[PDB]
Write an enzyme that holds these catalytic residues in place. Structure first.
Site, PDB file in Angstrom:
ATOM      1  N   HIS A  67      27.330  36.478 -66.001  1.00  0.00           N
ATOM      2  CA  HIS A  67      28.099  37.593 -66.558  1.00  0.00           C
ATOM      3  C   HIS A  67      29.002  37.231 -67.720  1.00  0.00           C
ATOM      4  O   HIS A  67      29.407  38.108 -68.480  1.00  0.00           O
ATOM      5  CB  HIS A  67      28.888  38.334 -65.466  1.00  0.00           C
ATOM      6  CG  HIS A  67      28.995  39.813 -65.699  1.00  0.00           C
ATOM      7  ND1 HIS A  67      29.371  40.355 -66.909  1.00  0.00           N
ATOM      8  CD2 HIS A  67      28.768  40.863 -64.876  1.00  0.00           C
ATOM      9  CE1 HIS A  67      29.356  41.674 -66.827  1.00  0.00           C
ATOM     10  NE2 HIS A  67      28.993  42.007 -65.604  1.00  0.00           N
TER      11      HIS A  67
ATOM     12  N   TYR B 221      38.138  49.643 -58.674  1.00  0.00           N
ATOM     13  CA  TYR B 221      37.661  49.226 -60.007  1.00  0.00           C
ATOM     14  C   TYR B 221      36.347  49.939 -60.336  1.00  0.00           C
ATOM     15  O   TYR B 221      35.388  49.893 -59.534  1.00  0.00           O
ATOM     16  CB  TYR B 221      37.400  47.701 -59.964  1.00  0.00           C
ATOM     17  CG  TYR B 221      37.113  47.053 -61.283  1.00  0.00           C
ATOM     18  CD1 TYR B 221      38.049  46.231 -61.893  1.00  0.00           C
ATOM     19  CD2 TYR B 221      35.889  47.250 -61.924  1.00  0.00           C
ATOM     20  CE1 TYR B 221      37.770  45.620 -63.123  1.00  0.00           C
ATOM     21  CE2 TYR B 221      35.611  46.657 -63.148  1.00  0.00           C
ATOM     22  CZ  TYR B 221      36.551  45.846 -63.742  1.00  0.00           C
ATOM     23  OH  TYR B 221      36.265  45.259 -64.962  1.00  0.00           O
TER      24      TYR B 221
ATOM     25  N   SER C 188      33.666  49.820 -63.751  1.00  0.00           N
ATOM     26  CA  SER C 188      33.343  49.251 -65.066  1.00  0.00           C
ATOM     27  C   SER C 188      33.065  50.322 -66.084  1.00  0.00           C
ATOM     28  O   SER C 188      32.306  51.263 -65.813  1.00  0.00           O
ATOM     29  CB  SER C 188      32.097  48.340 -64.998  1.00  0.00           C
ATOM     30  OG  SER C 188      32.108  47.474 -63.880  1.00  0.00           O
TER      31      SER C 188
ATOM     32  N   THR D  19      34.333  45.417 -71.715  1.00  0.00           N
ATOM     33  CA  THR D  19      34.538  46.482 -70.731  1.00  0.00           C
ATOM     34  C   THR D  19      36.035  46.825 -70.663  1.00  0.00           C
ATOM     35  O   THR D  19      36.895  46.041 -71.113  1.00  0.00           O
ATOM     36  CB  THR D  19      34.041  46.089 -69.285  1.00  0.00           C
ATOM     37  OG1 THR D  19      34.683  44.883 -68.849  1.00  0.00           O
ATOM     38  CG2 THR D  19      32.539  45.885 -69.243  1.00  0.00           C
TER      39      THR D  19
END
Ligand SMILES: COc1ccc(Cl)cc1S(=O)(=O)N1CCc2c(C)cc(C(=O)Nc3ccc(C(=O)O)cc3)cc21
Ligand SMILES: CCCCCCCCCCCCCCCC(=O)O
Length: 625
Positions: free
Chosen positions: A341, A455, A457, A468
């Site tokens: 990532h 959360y 994204s 992001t």
């Protein structure tokens, strides 16, 4: 030709004119931070945090902000968040497995016989190389988010825009409500890996490299997929070389080296150096610089749970977790992209994912009846060998024990909610995304009696070097609405419930558009913290507040991406007592794939999600609770 797209507008045509990522006003950021705290904090905690916010906004925060702004104005070629965000990923010392690397699984080739493992491995590999080729040629269409696709995603506009210089081209799209996206991450899609190092890992790329890496039963193989002229190796030859690999009868090694890419980053950094000392630099160089890693699994998928464990972590032997991405193809043709990532985000991997699916299924290189080229694969395919010392063997054994024990504790399960999805919700004038997020909040209240840090994204790729932003779906509105459904369901009429849901939807849509525009608070407050640490200052008290630590201990961690190419996706919780919720609201159904450790129960949560979604749809249909 070897291209899967033939854009008249160069791929990178808008990159030079992309808008810089906005830095919010500090006053707006502190307000948004406190707004997100409202559902989470009791009265005295809120007043305590409100007081720290005031100190911060008047004091060290104001001064950090002045400096953030001046730094940004000296680095207009980039974004304020770019450096800090890379650093967030690369300085992290925890395993990238579960903590960071997610997957997305392809839907099958709709033609049944094309899901043969060899056929599909070859077709998916060739399509990925065609993506690399098309990117190199500037023939991939620019990434562009259209508000009116019928006005701007047209040959007519494309013919015009291509004459506008890149220094001005973004403005031409803006004027037709089209928003070109940053595409700088595609520089690390191919021939790229993450190298473990003390303090901070390194992103490595070698564009000269022409070979694929294949893992099968934890053995490493490389062979060229691009010839010396720059053309794709004949697909019948690739098929031959893959058939060769699939034919290897060798048992899984006693010491599968791929386990090391799952270690703590300092442990792996030291073991990699030992690998070099023991003469393996050439071998690692070939692993590191391969176009990507193709992983050939030697089993079919039992079910969605097995598929999800397989694509998220597998057994530790047959993924090179450090690589930009691993393309995994199982024995029944089930395929996925598992990616690292740090180098890029969801939007960039998804475009690659979409083009590869489209090309490999619409224009397959080979058929289930193709005859592999008569070729001497043993001369073309090198089986890699690592010279392992005793310390290396011991490190692999330790890596394996740690991998096995942790993965043991991970559960994943899914739901497929079939009553409706996007069509029906839009009919009812609601954001489908808001409805899913409401359902998650309501589910967690039903299961645990709490409102917790949440959360979602959101891409900020509308801007130069964007990454992001965090959408914060836990709002006072979702908290009130959940309380109404769960705690006092007889107290409200269906009309009141529908209105509550409407107010969730609106505030969620507001937060979504703000986040996409760079007007969240999360990245801003992170960049200020990063700046203070980089300037060698004590951490400001704002960040030492339990409520700040709580805001960033994301128990409900959610992400969605939608495409006709994706069957499902997954990621592990980001905290030990969290869920990881990959979800999609489709035209006519809603799918959630949820992971958890021992500290949570994903099965129960999903029963709760199901119930909440039934309750939501009932209220929307006029029916009583
Ligand atoms: C904005 O919506 C979209 C726009 C274009 C596409 Cl191709 C898909 C979507 S979406 O269907 O996947 N989708 C629905 C609403 C939504 C929102 C609010 C955010 C995102 C999004 O940015 N997701 C995301 C997921 C993962 C990452 C990552 O890097 O991990 C980054 C962003 C997608 C989506
Ligand atoms: C980078 C983030 C990737 C993870 C997000 C993927 C979400 C799309 C798939 C949702 C899983 C739905 C499972 C239902 C079963 C089919």
């Amino acid at each position: 030709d070897d291209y899967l797209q033939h854009s008249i507008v160069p791929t990178m045509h808008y990159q030079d004119s992309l808008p810089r990522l906005p830095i919010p006003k500090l006053e707006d950021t502190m307000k948004r931070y406190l707004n997100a705290q409202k559902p989470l904090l009791d009265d005295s905690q809120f007043r305590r945090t409100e007081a720290l916010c005031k100190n911060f906004e008047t004091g060290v925060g104001k001064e950090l902000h002045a400096h953030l702004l001046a730094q940004d104005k000296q680095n207009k070629h980039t974004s304020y968040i770019s450096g800090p965000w890379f650093d967030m990923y690369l300085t992290a010392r925890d395993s990238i497995v579960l903590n960071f690397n997610p997957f997305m699984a392809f839907n099958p080739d709709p033609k049944s016989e094309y899901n043969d493992q060899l056929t599909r491995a070859t077709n998916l590999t060739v399509s990925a190389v065609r993506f690399l080729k098309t990117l190199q040629a500037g023939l991939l269409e620019p990434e562009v988010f259209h508000l009116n696709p019928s006005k701007s995603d047209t040959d007519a506009f494309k013919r015009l825009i291509r004459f506008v210089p890149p220094s001005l081209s973004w403005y031409g799209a803006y004027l037709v409500n089209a928003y070109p996206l940053d595409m700088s991450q595609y520089f690390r899609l191919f021939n790229s890996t993450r190298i473990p190092r003390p303090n901070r890992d390194e992103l490595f790329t070698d564009t000269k490299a022409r070979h694929l890496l294949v893992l099968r039963k934890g053995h490493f193989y490389v062979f060229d997929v691009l010839d010396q002229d720059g053309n794709i190796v004949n697909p019948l030859e690739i098929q031959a070389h893959l058939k060769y690999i699939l034919s290897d009868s060798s048992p899984v090694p006693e010491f599968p080296v791929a386990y090391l890419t799952s270690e703590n980053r300092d442990v792996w950094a030291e073991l990699r150096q030992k690998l070099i000392f023991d003469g393996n630099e050439e071998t690692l160089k070939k692993v590191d610089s391969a176009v990507f890693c193709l992983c050939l699994d030697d089993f079919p998928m039992k079910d969605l749970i097995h598929l999800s464990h397989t694509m998220l972590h597998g057994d530790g032997t047959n993924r090179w977790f450090d690589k930009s991405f691993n393309l995994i193809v199982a024995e029944d043709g089930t395929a996925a992209v598992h990616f690292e990532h740090s180098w890029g985000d969801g939007v960039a991997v998804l475009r690659f994912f979409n083009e590869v699916f489209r090309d490999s299924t619409q224009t397959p290189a080979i058929t289930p009846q193709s005859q592999p080229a008569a070729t001497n694969s043993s001369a073309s395919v090198e089986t890699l060998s690592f010279n392992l010392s005793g310390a290396l063997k011991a490190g692999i054994t330790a890596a394996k024990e740690k991998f096995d024990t942790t993965v043991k504790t991970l559960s994943i399960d899914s739901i497929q909610f079939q009553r409706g999805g996007k069509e029906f919700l839009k009919k009812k004038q609601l954001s489908p995304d808001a409805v899913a997020q409401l359902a998650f909040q309501m589910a967690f209240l039903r299961q645990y009696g709490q409102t917790v840090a949440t959360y979602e994204s959101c891409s900020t790729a509308a801007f130069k070097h964007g990454r992001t932003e965090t959408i914060r779906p836990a709002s006072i509105f979702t908290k009130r609405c959940s309380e109404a459904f769960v705690r006092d369901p007889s107290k409200h009429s269906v009309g009141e419930l529908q209105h509550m849901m409407a107010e969730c939807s609106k505030y969620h849509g507001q937060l979504t558009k703000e986040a996409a525009m760079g007007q969240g608070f999360d990245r801003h407050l992170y960049a200020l913290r990063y700046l203070a640490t980089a300037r060698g200052l004590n951490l400001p008290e704002l960040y030492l507040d339990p409520a700040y630590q709580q805001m960033n201990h994301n128990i409900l961690s959610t992400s969605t991406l939608n495409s006709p190419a994706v069957s499902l996706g997954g990621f592990a919780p980001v905290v030990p007592d969290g869920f990881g919720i990959a979800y999609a609201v489709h035209d006519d159904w809603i799918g959630c794939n949820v992971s958890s450790y021992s500290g949570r129960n994903a099965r129960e949560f999903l029963h709760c999600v199901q119930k909440c979604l039934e309750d939501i749809f009932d209220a929307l249909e006029g029916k009583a609770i």
